[PDB]
Enzyme design. Sequence first.
Site: not given
Ligand SMILES: CC1(C)[C@@]2(C(=O)O)CC[C@]1(C)C(=O)O2
Length: 358
Positions: A61, A340
């Site tokens: 993100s 992560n």
């Molecule tokens: C926004 C999120 C939680 C993440 C992140 O932490 O950036 C991991 C899965 C997810 C839906 C996404 O697309 O990115």
Amino acid sequence: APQQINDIVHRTITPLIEQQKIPGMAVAVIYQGKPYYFTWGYADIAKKQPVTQQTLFELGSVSKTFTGVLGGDAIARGEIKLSDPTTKYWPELTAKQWNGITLLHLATYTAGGLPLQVPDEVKSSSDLLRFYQNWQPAWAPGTQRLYANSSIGLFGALAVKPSGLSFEQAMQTRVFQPLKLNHTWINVPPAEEKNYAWGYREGKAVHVSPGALDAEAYGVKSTIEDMARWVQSNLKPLDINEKTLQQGIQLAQSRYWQTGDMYQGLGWEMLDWPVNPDSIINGSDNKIALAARPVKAITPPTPAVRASWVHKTGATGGFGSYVAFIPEKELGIVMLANKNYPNPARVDAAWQILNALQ
Ligand SMILES: CC1(C)[C@@]2(C(=O)O)CC[C@]1(C)C(=O)O2
């Protein structure tokens, strides 16, 4: 490197890597506008490939910051306005709940409860139309913030429509190329595969899977050098020669909504500097960051504030990233890892480093 930077980076990152069992990591500190690089561990455990300054990581993100700036650039070009109804650019979106939902709402997660994820069963373009037409809001537009790939992802796809360019082509030509981010990709080319780290999830090597609106919401890969340059570009946009790109950077750090102590920009989020470290650290936890919260409109938006902590977390199944900077101080950090690991650990480490160097 200056010893102060060497010492605070290593004193902070060494235990973080140990505690979180991070297989590989790259860090850039921007100090008085200049980058200093640090790397640890493995891009590919099986092939014994180390992390280097050329290693590509999945930004997850953090990609939204590129989307927000590309959208800002389209506004500066006169191609779109944030006050435009979503239906101006997608006339087939005829369902009545879309009345009053603007590009601003999509960009800032305030459309009224668009979901975090686009459903995996949405593959085709007609699937995507069906999904948005059938979606029912929980809240009136511009009243609640719910962080969502389906919200800013649709913003990115619509923002580039008047240009006629694909999202990827627009991002390459209008953002990556002028900023000389020549090792930053929405799709990693064969020539660059040797540098693409594996992510690690439950001990398995993984890469992000294709999904609808992936490029727009979470799909960029980049190196620690290009990410340091992205920070430099957002720390001092007045130094950018392309007028619309400079203006788009300014628009993305403008303050559109407030919830608690944070302000929503386009992709970027901002707090006033000096910040309370508890606010950014605790606030970064998904228990807060992904929660539905009422927002106060900032009418009209405040222009980008130099004395801000500007930042974004992002992850994929196998990667965890964080970027933070303070324009007033020409000070910033990029942390890229191929696991992560929890947001608050990222932000805690970043604050310990930047606080020591401020
Ligand atoms: C926004 C999120 C939680 C993440 C992140 O932490 O950036 C991991 C899965 C997810 C839906 C996404 O697309 O990115």
